[PDB]
């Protein structure tokens, strides 16, 4: 399952005649594109690797 979430503030005078506005005209743009399932679980670093990435000297 993939979730695409959006939030922001849109000025009405930027909306085109087709009731559409580019995402770069939205002030507080919050764009999220996440997913779940084993496909997403395969793109998270292992806890030990994620610890060595932060605490290893080099």
């Amino acid at each position: 399952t993939e979730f695409i979430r959006f939030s922001g503030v849109v000025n009405p005078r930027t909306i085109s005649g087709s009731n559409s506005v580019p995402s770069t005209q939205v002030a507080d743009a919050r764009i999220e594109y996440v997913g779940n399932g084993y496909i997403n679980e395969a793109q998270n670093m292992g806890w030990l690797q994620r610890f060595f990435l932060n605490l290893s000297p080099m």
């Binding site: 005078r13 909306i15 085109s16 005649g17």
Partner: protein, 54 residues
């Protein structure tokens, strides 16, 4: 009527006001709008304010 025609009162004066506008309803005798971009730009501004986004 001599004093009014000869003098003016202090503080009783006229100022100058200026503005920009559009004149509509001409019989084909308006701007070419290809050499005056501000005419079309301000018309689009007026339409966008009124609720039409060209």
């Amino acid at each position: 009527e001599r004093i009014r025609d000869l003098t003016s009162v202090q503080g009783v004066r006229e100022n100058s006001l200026i503005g920009y506008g559009l004149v509509v309803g001409l019989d084909g005798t308006g701007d070419q709008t290809t050499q005056t971009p501000f005419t079309t730009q301000t018309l689009n501004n007026m339409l966008s304010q009124l609720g039409i986004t060209v």
